[PDB]
Design a protein around this nucleic acid. Structure first.
Lengths: 141, 79, 62, 190, 203, 108, 174, 196
RNA sequence: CAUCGGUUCUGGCGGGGGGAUAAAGGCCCAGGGAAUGUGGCUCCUCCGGGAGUGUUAUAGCCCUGGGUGUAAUACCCUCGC
RNA sequence: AACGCGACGAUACUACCCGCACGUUGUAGACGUAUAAGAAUAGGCUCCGGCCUCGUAUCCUAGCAGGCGAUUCCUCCGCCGGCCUCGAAGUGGCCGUCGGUAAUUCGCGUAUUGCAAUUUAGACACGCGCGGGAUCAAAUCCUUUGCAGACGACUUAGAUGUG
């Protein structure tokens, strides 16, 4: 009996699933109300990732691969925080490819005009030498 | 029916002012006539309406009847 | 009576076309084509082998 | 109400191989292979166990949940078709004019064609073409019997229905004129 | 909100009314709009409902003379989209005509729009608007049943265009790969101060 | 040589006048500025000068190009559409015409 | 019907030489504000004890906040509403963290499913289910089940309405 | 369908050259003169390019054929030219067949055969301006009808307040293009046969 | 353009008062309780995980009272820049 | 479609084509007016390592509206010629020549438009000019015809001939 099934695998909301909100804050599920509202708590010490405990809608939230294992259902702020610095959610969130992309976005939006001109000129250095490399690979084959 | 390949004449939903005014006049006459028949109505009506009661699926209904009996006994003792 | 657009009459005509008049028309066709063929037989840029360009618009004029 | 989760199970035999990609179910067995596209129903296919297909639906309605049973039965019918096959046997009876039935296999299509003649003395020849993969044979153990076999239950039963429906008595009393071809027995090849 | 010289929209997977409203607003605002592949356009609801609508539209004609003044029934998918667009535009005004002359609609993707970038409109996409389980129909299929003769010609032209686009796809994949090893090989010869400053700024 | 542009203004499209469903007041015009989508984004451009540039037939004082000038007065609605007041009301033929919103007077 | 705050409204009849200390009456009102709270309290006083606003007065109005707004709770609601047939009972169950949110959701769903407005709905009891065994409706029984974890199929991505044109086809998988 | 190219022969007659002119007696007869030089320059590279183009891009091939009008007793000297489709075979076969048929007379007996049932395309005899009675077969009004009896009494008695397109009116009758079908050929007689 | 005056649109900031001197909640102290049974123990298996026991253990949760606390914050009112 | 389209032949001139020389020439409206897979959305992409809310991206973008001269680099762009190629309303790929070119650094000029006044700058079509290259044509009125016809219109014939 050989079975080859190629299908989809959604990230699944569960107690301990970590959500990213639109403001950059991070939270974790502590209790499931319904399929459109959840109870989430962000105990992170970093203020940018902090989220006050309360109800958030799933439409107002995203899905991250971080899940806190063995997190009790309905755990309060102290227990969720003990699990949070037990698991190191902040470090894994920084290692995820999303937080790099938003951090790169503030590194774009915080630029001065002098910073933009420096970006232009350093990019021109990199593109000149990349065009030289491009000539070497194109000449080889 | 052959409605898909050969449709018939459409039914217009665009109301006319004459029809709207006539319908409004008949409607107001109907409320006035129902008021007159309610005033002249000889059908018997109860002084106290039929109470619907308490739903059976209510989980604390037995507790509510406990408080009902307790309050009735307390009122009887007070009176 | 059945119409000219009747499905049964159309199927009868299709069977007639495939089974009866078909070989007759094919034999006449091949003999006429034989007579007509009998009468008929009785660089890339510089040579024209390569199809080059000859010697209202769909796009917005910009 | 909207159902949070609903699941169904499909057992698979050891000789049957199942491939599911973009809801295109391929079921391969000893007798051949069958293909069926099921992209019109929102269903999650999974491997919950060795030899068990899991059908799942999330946040669906009652009709969407009830479609899973139809999906299960079609998949099980494909499995039964590639494993044991499907066989419909029909009988044809006549009162006075013997029905002359002839079965041939067209080379350029690969499909079977059945010609029926002398149906209540009619001079027309009724030609019915089977679906591909359906084999028609004259039974030799019994009298006036056609046997249709294949891997697709829908195709075999539809060909049997077409053979039954091509011989319809017209403008006569059906209590008196009993002529026709009728599907008698349904089962598996093995 | 971005001003372009001309915006090319693939008609595949779009909804007729919503796409028509959006492009009509763009045309009346002053944006030049070209819509290609109107045969793959979608209308919600079951297909027999659209058949009812088009046959009811076929019923209308001027009684005393059908050659003038009557509703002229254009059977093409692009012309049906043009009628839907025109119904949302004051076409009997000079401004309306000057907006309608900024629109072009086609079946398939005729050249040189085959070598131009095509936009999609999220507010009119079926996968972003319709609920699952709801039926949908094809404007091309409706046109083919009501008398549009050029379904198969557009089909084979789209087949050959897709073959040529596939050829351009392996060329583009080859260029993407050799650019990737070009950047990787050049990365060794990048000045480290340039690397650190560019990484700090965000590239 | 330089391959750069020289644009020091921001583009816009002139939609219509201040109007109801029937009555239209050409004393105030409606503009989309390029890249603005919100009232907060449009709040930057309040008080900025705005110029509409057109061409004529005759040659007066060394130019065949005429400019009508104005300023951005207040936001309109929620989609960043702005209201503009000019020294002369805009032509009605300019519905869909491009307009130049200046960066001055600046408060930066 | 709005941002409902919940009020304890206590009133009484005006003092008289015959009755120097009249009996006090307290009700729990779900109202948009204090004016509607007093108005509905007087309306129910006419309906029950026949005490008028001219002959009575309001002694106390207090805002009752939830003890635990951060705790997910199940609410059972016993209600009477008026339709063209007459008066009807319903028992319904909801899942919210506060009585005010439970009552607002009850209003919204009651209007959506049976076309009842505020003046045609009478709230009799709103009780917090102390145990999960008391839950009766299957759509709340499925939410209070063991280890409930579900996916989110076909989520339309968030695209700004002012972003009219997109350069790629969006995905609906997250 | 859209015509991509046409390929012309090197030598063409004066009777088919007359088809391109209205005042041929005053004309210098310069038609096709520079085109005949394209059969000479570059060994026909241009005409070979059109032949390769027509072999590659097109799917329907039609020869151009003109009738020899000088063999008829008609006073006309300008010939009749049409497009005749080549059916059967591939596009390359059609192009090679047409190129072989250039500057060549094809008789009637190799296109059509005795016992063949064909279609006839022609123009109806003209009658000029004709009234409704002969134009539509309408019933004549009784004798001494006021304002005429070879007419239609009611062109309209009902709404619309217009004359409908289906009401019989007087006008041109005849000189219509007509395509009649199912015409049997009884004989294809030969001109050189003195007993045809 | 700057400084003004009248009318008006918009944005931000610093304080005060009230409610259950908000209600929460965080950290401690003292009690009481249960399973959508944690750890542990027993029994089955596809060895993946299931069934039984119960009061915190190798997770925690609910109720009451007290301290921090005249805490902060939401909401309403209110003084100005 | 008499305000839809294609192919072909002959095209006298002030007609046609090429070069530059500019428009008190006109344009529902240039200012980087840059960017080609197809397909699915209860699934996709790949360099086969992995990746996917996100175009918030990529390319290009510095110099008298962008000069002159070096240092330095072999990068980018454009015009031509050749070979291919592109028919859905036809255009791109490679090679060769030529010309320009801050990727690095430096030197001389910028003023005076006087504290803002469009930054007159692009494309298409049109016209007047020269200096050249190529070509010497048709239609209508008139006479005639009757396969046509109220008149127009239509079928014909009128240049040396089977008139």
């Amino acid at each position: 009996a050989e079975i080859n099934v190629e299908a989809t695998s959604w990230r699944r909301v569960e107690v301990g699933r970590v959500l990213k909100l639109e403001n950059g804050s991070l939270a974790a599920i502590v209790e499931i109300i319904d399929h459109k509202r959840v109870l989430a708590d962000g105990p992170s010490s970093d203020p940018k990732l902090a989220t006050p405990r309360g109800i958030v809608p799933l439409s107002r939230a995203l899905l991250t691969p971080i899940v806190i294992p063995k997190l009790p259902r309905g755990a309060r702020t102290g227990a969720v925080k003990k699990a949070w610095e037990a698991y190191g959610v902040d470090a894994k969130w920084k290692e995820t490819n999303w937080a790099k992309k938003q951090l790169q976005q503030e590194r774009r939006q915080s630029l001065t005009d002098f910073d933009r001109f420096k970006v232009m000129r350093l990019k021109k250095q990199r593109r000149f030498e990349e065009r030289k490399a491009l000539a070497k690979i194109k000449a080889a084959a | 029916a052959g409605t898909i390949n050969k449709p018939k004449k459409p039914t217009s939903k665009r109301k006319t002012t004459r029809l709207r005014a006539k319908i409004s006049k008949r409607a107001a006459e109907k409320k006035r006539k129902e008021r007159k028949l309610a005033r002249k109505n000889p059908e018997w009506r109860s002084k106290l309406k039929k109470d619907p009661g308490i739903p059976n699926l209510f989980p604390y209904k037995e507790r509510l009847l406990q408080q009902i009996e307790e309050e009735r006994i307390r009122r009887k003792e007070e009176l | 009576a059945k119409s000219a657009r009747a499905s049964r009459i159309k199927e009868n005509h299709q069977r007639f076309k495939k089974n009866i008049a078909g070989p007759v028309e094919a034999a006449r066709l091949e003999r006429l084509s034989a007579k007509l063929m009998a009468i008929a037989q009785a660089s890339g840029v510089k040579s024209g082998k390569s199809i080059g360009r000859k010697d209202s618009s769909i796009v917005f004029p910009m | 109400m909207r159902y949070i989760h609903s699941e169904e199970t499909i057992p698979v035999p050891e000789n049957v191989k199942v491939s599911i990609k973009s809801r295109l179910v391929t079921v391969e067995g000893p007798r051949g292979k069958l293909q069926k596209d099921l992209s019109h129903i929102a269903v999650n296919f999974s491997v919950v166990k060795k030899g068990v297909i899991g059908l799942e639906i999330h946040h669906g309605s009652r009709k969407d949940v009830a479609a899973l049973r139809t999906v299960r039965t079609i998949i099980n019918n494909m499995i039964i078709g590639v494993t044991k096959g499907f066989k419909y046997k029909m009988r044809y009876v006549y009162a006075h004019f013997p029905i002359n039935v002839n079965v041939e296999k067209n080379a350029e299509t690969g499909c079977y064609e059945v010609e029926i003649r002398n149906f209540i003395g009619e001079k027309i020849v009724r030609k019915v073409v089977m679906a591909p993969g359906v084999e028609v044979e004259i039974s030799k153990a019994q009298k006036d019997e056609l046997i249709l076999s294949g891997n697709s239950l829908e195709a075999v039963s539809q060909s049997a229905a077409d053979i039954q429906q091509i011989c319809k008595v017209r403008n006569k009393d059906i209590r008196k004129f009993l002529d026709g071809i009728y599907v008698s027995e349904k089962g598996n090849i093995v | 909100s971005s001003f372009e010289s001309v915006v090319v929209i693939d008609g595949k997977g779009h909804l007729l009314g919503r796409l028509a409203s959006i492009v009509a607003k763009q045309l009346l605002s002053g944006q030049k709009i070209v819509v290609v592949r109107c045969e793959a356009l979608n209308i919600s609801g079951e297909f027999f409902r659209a058949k009812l609508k088009y046959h009811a539209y076929l019923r209308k004609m001027t009684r005393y003379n059908p050659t003038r003044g009557g509703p002229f029934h254009f059977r093409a998918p692009s012309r049906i989209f043009y009628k839907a667009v025109r119904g949302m535009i004051p076409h009997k005004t000079a401004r309306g005509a000057a907006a309608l002359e900024r629109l072009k609609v086609f079946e398939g993707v005729p050249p040189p729009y085959d070598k131009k970038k095509k936009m999609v409109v999220p507010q009119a996409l079926r996968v972003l608007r319709l609920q699952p389980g709801r039926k949908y129909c094809t404007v091309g299929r409706l046109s083919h049943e009501v008398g549009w003769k050029y379904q198969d010609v557009v089909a084979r032209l789209e087949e050959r265009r897709k073959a040529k686009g596939a050829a351009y796809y392996e060329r583009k994949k080859l260029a993407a790969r050799q650019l990737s090893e070009a950047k990787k090989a050049a990365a060794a010869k990048v000045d480290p101060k340039v690397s650190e400053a560019l990484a700090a700024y965000g590239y | 040589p330089s391959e750069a542009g020289h644009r020091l203004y921001v583009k816009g499209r002139h939609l219509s006048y201040q109007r109801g469903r029937r009555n239209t007041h050409p004393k105030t015009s409606l503009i989309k500025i390029e890249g603005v989508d919100d009232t907060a984004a449009a709040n930057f451009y309040l008080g900025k000068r705005v110029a509409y540039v057109y061409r004529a037939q005759k040659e007066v004082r060394g130019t065949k190009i005429r400019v009508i000038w104005g300023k951005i007065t207040r936001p309109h609605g929620n989609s960043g559409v702005v209201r503009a007041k000019f020294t002369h009301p805009l032509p009605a033929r300019s519905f869909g015409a491009s307009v130049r919103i200046m960066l001055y007077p600046s408060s930066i | 019907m709005g941002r409902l705050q919940e009020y304890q409204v206590i009133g009484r009849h005006l003092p008289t030489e015959a009755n120097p200390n009249p009996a006090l009456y307290r009700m729990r009102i779900f109202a948009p504000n204090e004016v509607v709270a007093k108005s509905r309290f007087w309306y129910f006083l006419r309906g029950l004890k026949k005490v008028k606003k001219a002959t009575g007065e309001i002694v106390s109005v207090n805002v009752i906040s939830e003890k635990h707004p951060l705790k997910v709770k199940n609410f059972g609601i016993w209600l009477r509403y008026d339709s063209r047939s007459g008066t009807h009972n319903m028992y319904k169950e909801y899942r919210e963290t506060s009585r005010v949110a439970a009552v607002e959701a009850m209003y919204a769903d009651m209007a959506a499913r049976h076309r009842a407005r505020f003046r045609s709905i009478h709230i009799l009891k709103v009780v917090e289910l102390e145990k999960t065994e008391d839950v009766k409706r299957p759509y709340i029984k499925q939410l209070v089940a063991k280890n409930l974890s579900f996916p989110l199929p076909h989520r339309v991505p968030k695209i700004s309405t002012k972003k009219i044109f997109s350069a790629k086809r969006p995905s609906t998988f997250s | 369908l859209r015509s991509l190219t046409t390929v012309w022969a090197e030598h063409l007659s004066d009777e088919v050259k007359r088809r391109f002119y209205k005042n041929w007696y005053k004309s210098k007869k310069k038609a096709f003169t520079k085109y005949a030089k394209k059969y000479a320059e570059n060994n026909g590279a241009s005409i070979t390019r059109e032949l390769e183009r027509i072999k590659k891009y097109c799917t329907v091939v039609r020869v151009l054929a003109h009738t020899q009008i000088r063999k008829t007793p008609l006073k006309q000297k300008k010939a009749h030219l049409m497009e005749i489709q080549i059916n059967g075979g591939s596009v390359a076969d059609k192009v090679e067949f047409g190129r072989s048929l250039f500057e060549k007379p094809v008789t009637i007996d190799t296109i059509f055969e005795k016992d063949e049932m064909i279609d006839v395309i022609a123009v109806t005899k003209g009658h000029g301006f004709v009234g409704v009675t002969a134009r539509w077969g309408t019933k004549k009004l009784p004798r001494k009808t006021h304002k005429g009896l070879r007419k239609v009494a009611c062109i309209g008695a009902w709404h619309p307040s217009h004359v409908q397109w289906t009401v019989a009116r007087a006008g041109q009758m005849g000189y219509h293009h007509r395509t009649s079908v199912n015409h049997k050929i009884y004989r294809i007689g030969k001109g050189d046969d003195e007993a045809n």
